[PDB]
């Protein structure tokens, strides 16, 4: 696949130019918050049994028509696949939040995922109420500005890592609808 | 070996099914070059990984290895080790796989398993 | 033996994909996105049909027929009209791959001009190939911004209805060749018919009513000011005093 | 307009084909059921200023909300605007009852009706509660016949659903 | 459109006129004699190809100057287009056979032809005479004096309906000249 | 596709409207005359090959030049084909009187007649000489009933007028 | 589209006979009950504002889910076009009631209605509950059991004809699922 | 969806042209009068729930007759079918007083509102009177200034005349 260091060597392979002192400053500034990258990744997988589960205890809480009979989240055959559906979407973002490039998320998860919901009848306004939650909590986890879970970290700004994980959520968002 | 093929990790996905289907045998690069249509026809997307396994088994080298020295019980267990990854069950599922060869040929014998 | 035939081992039979090279996708992605191709081609032949039959309700806004629907006037030539009516699709099918690419996006040029007023209108229009290739036809067969329902009143205007139609004979030929769009016959199953069918409905161009053909000179006039003459005010001063210039000259995607 | 008769001839001038046994049923058809229908058409205009006042009064109990200051039917002179309009919509249907068409129902009454009635704020169900009085105060034993007095209520609905 | 069913309706719409028993005898004069109306029209549309087929060879056996070089029936379009101009004008009279009004025939065809019959030189003297070759037999088919095609009708009278058809050969004959 | 039943409801899709009461009187008038068109239906089907043998050898004498060698009907195989191709003339009106309108005739027998009779070189004078024989050799009160003489006769010369 | 006179032509064209007397006993049953076929249709279209209204306002009480967002009816356009989608659900069956078959239903709109329903994301649990709640009220205006609406018709029975529209909307229910 | 940006770059795209100084000069007026227009968004997050009891109960004193069983507010549960629709109109103008223009309002707010209401017997004359209490209640010192006083109130007046 690709990552954030694999991206720049194929940016420069089109020029056939050696990576020297020009674009190595972006990657020597990668490692300065390279610890802060990993210090934000384990904040996702700490409370991930709660993260997929307020996505069904809040989404149905303001849209109970999905659990109507004949609905898309009606039966428990579908519900075990629906929690299976939401936990891989949280899994591939954390693969791309860690590696710093979106090209493990689009090419292995998302190409075809537009027509997973076309070919089945799964809606689009349902799944964006199940992914605008996850764009709100995962930028409220990584500040530790949440209410219950309190990661007692070292102090300092992390809002470059907030917009980094935020770019994936419209990258997952524009692909599914 | 997973799904969702790239072009970089076709080199993992091919030889982790050469080694399954040839039964961990040594396939030299002169024998690898005899697959040069059907190994190419997998890396297009003409052939999925369920049907490349049939196209590896319908070769000349698989006919040379596991059909020309191997007798009729040694034939039907080296299909079953390589295509399904298991041994036979009883006597009824060997002779039902015997007469898929004799009455209606060998290429329908191998593709009965797939 | 004791012979027996069960069901097929290959009953889907690869009836979904014969392009025979993908972009190396999968087996599961390659099955259902080919199942989306047999669905999202088959709503392109719905949504262009299901509003043009609603645009055929403007042809009978009360419910009965005026001389919009002059179909074939002499009795035997109703089934003679249907030969080049179905060849209007067949000759549009065999258009060039340089022409088939621009038939997409130059149908998309005025598609967002007709759909700027509602965002629920423009999302369907940029998601289909053959919707706005029929919607631009289906909107101008209703409120009559073709030449099919408009007559020249001035001989001034008949010199300018005959001024840009040879520019619609310009772009139906890239050289000394002729195209498949500006044709007139296919198998000499006619004698003089495309002039016969013109002057039969050119009779209908001036006798529906008076009020049928006067607000259409205030329908088609601001139409071309919105669509074409918005960037050059010399071009709309030939449009407003002469509405035989705004209901004449067309888009470039579908030809002539 | 749109009748029994001109719906038959609307096909032939379009298609160009000449009238054979396509155009040979409908004009013969309204000899067979019009005897109660021409009975019904005079039955409106035999007591029509009574049935102007029989329908148009009862909605002012259900809709008394114009008599306050600040509405359309405010003073006494809107009653002169009121019952003049009751003389007119029933004229569209007994004209049709000799024919059996829905033509001046659409040529005169309801074409463009949703534009004007939200412009000038004409209350829709305030009309229908006076209008459906004639839908319900009917004894097809005694008052009219049940052969084509029901056709009069198969055409008074076309006021009602198109005003709603 | 309007029929004769509606031409008696819009002769009462201006003066707010409600209709009575002497106003529905403007249309019960129609329908009880309307069994003759079905018995009138279907035998001039049966033989309708030999109307103009006698009105062309009979036209030049009574006037052999129309097929002159420079005439309006010399070129082979101008006889193949000449029977187009007279076959459907039987149907325009047959549209007034069924209706009983002639305000559709001047308003579907005859609103703009006599000023275009001058615009390519279609003559005005044998305008009404080209009506007047099948004008014998079409009144003589509905009243049954025909010799080569004598019919088997429910016998009686159509002479009040024969002045109905005599009004409408001239009503398409007025607006051509 | 062109009957009494599908008069207006194919054009009501071009109207945005329902079957109203301009659309429902017009079928009941066929039903009082539906007791004369089934009295011609199996009357024709009960005399189906004795009206072949009447109409068949009548037209071979009227144009005797088609029995010459080197013409169209030169052999013996094509002259039972001319029995076979006037069979469906009197078989498609056996469909068409059932449906009331001009449904099976205007699409299946007549739609593009002379375009396959000219390049095939089939002169239609020898077609309709079989028809105009039995167009008027059909007596009214003895072959069938009295209204049935002109219940049959709407398409009896219209079949020649579709070829005219 | 066609009629049920010509549906027996579909039952005769592949054998190519001269159509006899013994096989129109269900077609002279069409003229025997053709008043009763047409005596059903007027209580549908008189109630043209009643039949559409409880199709949508029956859905809201029995299923309060979809009104809140993430739902198939949220906007006013989702009220102005959803009631308009059931307009032609009723209208394209409204020609087939007098006819007697499936001549007008599936060839003109239901040649794939579910391939139209997928691309916008139309909920088929709402679609089945649309066409079942109006078919249950269709025959209740025939069997004279409406909670307000009582007619005055002729005497007899249409339990033979109650499986006409019951066999219609189950095919409308077939193509939407 | 309809503002200064979402109509001026369609005019450059229909003419096939880049942004020159034509649409550069005409878009910088968006921001200086946005500083007071967003103070109504900063106003009624804290009185989104108490202004609907002073003005959503101001369409009810004159229209107090409409609590009969059969009307719109027939039950308290059918005042509960008012209580989500009457405050959507202030919420749908809260969505587009963010944007400056009115582009969220003419997609789902008014854009096809009155096509249901005549069939569900809903009169919109009492819809105007609900926010006609907001036609007078906005303070010039206290709530916001009179620079944005008509910029609050012409958007209230935008939802008047689209219902007309
Ligand atoms: C796991 C349970 C974590 C946790 C995660 C967070 N959730 C946050 C916001 C949020 N919570 C819900 C569910 C809630 N909202 C509802 O409307 C209903 C019932 C109908 C429920 C149960 C949703 C749907 C959303 C986000 C969508 C939105 O923004 O509208 C969140 C951010 C705020 C916060 O600090 O709570 C986090 C961190 N929260 C927890 O308590 C445990 C540790
Ligand atoms: C079609 C064959 C009809 C038919 C038509 C009738 N034509 C009648 C009179 C008539 N025919 C002509 C044309 C004829 N006369 C000529 O001098 C020449 C050639 C130079 C031709 C071809 C004329 C001019 C007229 C007179 C019309 C008039 O007075 O204006 C006619 C009435 C006479 C009669 O009944 O014998 C009829 C019925 N005859 C048929 O029965 C078939 C169906
Ligand atoms: C003058 C134009 C005619 C003529 C007219 C009369 N027709 C009379 C009766 C009549 N004709 C028909 C047949 C009509 N109905 C159809 O469905 C079809 C097509 C298949 C046709 C042609 C009917 C049903 C009737 C009513 C009684 C009957 O069955 O005969 C008629 C008698 C008076 C009356 O209208 O009741 C007259 C005078 N007859 C003529 O001889 C001239 C040429
Ligand atoms: C004999 C006195 C006739 C004549 C008859 C021939 N007809 C030939 C072919 C043919 N005819 C029809 C029309 C009819 N048959 C149908 O099945 C239907 C409806 C579907 C209709 C209206 C058709 C369709 C055909 C083509 C089928 C076939 O080839 O049999 C025919 C052979 C063609 C040829 O001549 O090359 C003959 C000889 N021809 C005559 O000369 C006189 C008029
Ligand atoms: C079951 C579907 C119905 C029902 C039907 C019956 N109708 C019977 C007779 C009938 N109804 C009408 C009126 C009809 N003709 C029209 O022109 C119009 C308006 C467009 C309508 C509604 C007629 C003319 C007739 C025939 C005799 C009569 O006038 O009464 C009927 C009696 C049997 C028969 O048709 O002979 C039945 C069973 N009856 C029911 O209980 C439900 C509502
Ligand atoms: C009483 C307080 C009012 C009245 C209220 C009613 N409104 C009813 C339904 C309704 N309202 C809207 C508009 C609003 N809701 C939306 O979801 C959106 C767009 C996002 C808007 C602008 C709609 C679309 C509807 C229909 C479906 C729905 O409820 O959402 C209603 C129910 C009808 C009934 O009970 O009869 C009532 C009572 N109507 C009045 O006349 C008074 C003044
Ligand atoms: C007949 C002359 C003999 C006899 C023959 C039987 N052979 C049976 C089964 C069988 N035989 C072989 C060997 C041969 N057949 C092949 O297909 C091949 C090639 C691979 C060879 C060398 C095999 C492999 C089998 C399969 C085992 C099986 O079919 O069960 C046999 C069947 C016994 C049974 O029903 O289980 C018979 C009867 N036996 C005789 O009695 C005469 C002497
Ligand atoms: C403007 C340049 C248009 C255009 C107009 C043409 N239409 C031609 C033939 C034709 N068009 C229609 C459809 C028309 N009838 C309707 O009821 C409605 C909707 C209310 C519409 C739009 C019909 C039925 C016909 C058949 C008449 C005939 O030509 O025989 C036409 C002649 C060429 C042809 O199509 O064969 C022209 C130029 N055509 C266009 O491509 C643009 C969009
Ligand atoms: C023959 C007895 C006449 C005669 C007839 C001619 N008419 C010619 C052309 C023509 N006719 C019409 C009217 C026709 N077109 C329609 O669309 C309708 C109704 C729907 C009708 C009746 C028109 C508009 C035209 C112009 C050509 C066109 O259709 O575009 C004609 C040909 C003239 C020529 O080509 O030079 C003839 C011969 N002329 C006569 O002298 C006698 C009186
Ligand atoms: C009402 C108080 C007036 C009145 C108004 C009428 N105008 C009618 C038709 C009509 N109006 C226009 C102008 C309008 N259309 C436009 O396109 C533009 C802008 C460019 C404007 C201002 C036109 C062009 C027409 C002709 C219709 C058409 O073009 O299709 C009209 C309809 C007449 C009718 O129904 O027959 C009315 C009633 N007329 C009055 O009596 C008073 C003074
Ligand atoms: C309004 C929307 C719009 C677009 C988004 C673009 C996209 C676009 N490009 C082309 C058409 C083309 N585009 C290119 C472009 C290129 N080829 C190369 O080798 C380069 C990589 C690259 C630019 C330097 C070429 C060469 C063609 C013509 C194809 C040909 O004739 O060979 C066409 C077909 C147009 C037609 O002929 O009908 C379209 C829609 N053009 C548009 O009108
Ligand atoms: C053009 C239309 C037209 C009409 C409808 C009648 C209208 C009418 N209704 C009644 C008057 C009446 N009519 C009835 C009969 C009935 N009332 C009902 O509600 C039952 C459904 C129905 C039984 C068949 C009754 C019971 C009265 C007296 C009560 C009243 O309505 O005032 C009277 C007084 C004379 C009488 O009692 O008949 C008149 C003229 N006349 C017309 O010219
Ligand atoms: C549905 C098709 C159908 C038919 C064509 C006849 C077929 C037929 N024709 C005749 C036989 C005959 N039929 C007639 C009658 C007439 N000849 C005419 O030219 C007049 C128009 C008509 C008088 C009204 C005559 C004169 C004969 C004897 C000559 C012959 O056999 O053709 C007979 C013997 C009995 C009889 O005379 O009726 C029969 C069954 N029957 C049918 O069921
Ligand atoms: C969204 C709308 C909205 C409101 C209306 C207010 C609602 C509101 N009204 C009043 C209460 C009041 N507010 C005013 C002020 C005024 N009354 C008028 O008629 C003038 C327009 C204006 C002066 C410029 C007056 C006079 C009262 C007391 C009478 C009353 O209850 O309205 C108060 C108490 C404190 C205050 O006066 O502000 C509040 C919060 N808040 C809101 O969020």
mmCIF file of C-alpha atoms in Angstrom, chain C residues 109 112-113 116-121 226-227 230-231, chain H residues 1-2 6-7 10-11 13-16 106-108:
data_model
loop_
_atom_site.group_PDB
_atom_site.id
_atom_site.type_symbol
_atom_site.label_atom_id
_atom_site.label_comp_id
_atom_site.label_asym_id
_atom_site.label_seq_id
_atom_site.Cartn_x
_atom_site.Cartn_y
_atom_site.Cartn_z
ATOM 1 C CA UNK C 109 -23.479 22.515 -19.599
ATOM 2 C CA UNK C 112 -26.931 23.177 -14.268
ATOM 3 C CA UNK C 113 -28.502 26.228 -15.922
ATOM 4 C CA UNK C 116 -29.551 26.165 -10.280
ATOM 5 C CA UNK C 117 -32.808 27.033 -8.487
ATOM 6 C CA UNK C 118 -33.017 23.782 -6.487
ATOM 7 C CA UNK C 119 -30.257 21.506 -5.159
ATOM 8 C CA UNK C 120 -32.643 18.533 -5.328
ATOM 9 C CA UNK C 121 -32.707 19.079 -9.131
ATOM 10 C CA UNK C 226 -30.526 33.040 -19.950
ATOM 11 C CA UNK C 227 -28.820 30.202 -21.828
ATOM 12 C CA UNK C 230 -26.009 36.179 -21.079
ATOM 13 C CA UNK C 231 -22.408 37.102 -21.955
ATOM 14 C CA UNK H 1 -27.104 26.846 -1.732
ATOM 15 C CA UNK H 2 -28.357 30.250 -2.868
ATOM 16 C CA UNK H 6 -23.620 30.082 -5.214
ATOM 17 C CA UNK H 7 -25.042 32.259 -7.989
ATOM 18 C CA UNK H 10 -22.484 29.619 -12.062
ATOM 19 C CA UNK H 11 -22.556 32.781 -14.187
ATOM 20 C CA UNK H 13 -19.248 28.737 -15.529
ATOM 21 C CA UNK H 14 -22.131 29.215 -17.963
ATOM 22 C CA UNK H 15 -19.978 31.735 -19.844
ATOM 23 C CA UNK H 16 -17.010 29.340 -19.649
ATOM 24 C CA UNK H 106 -35.873 27.377 -0.767
ATOM 25 C CA UNK H 107 -34.888 23.718 -0.805
ATOM 26 C CA UNK H 108 -36.904 22.172 2.035
#
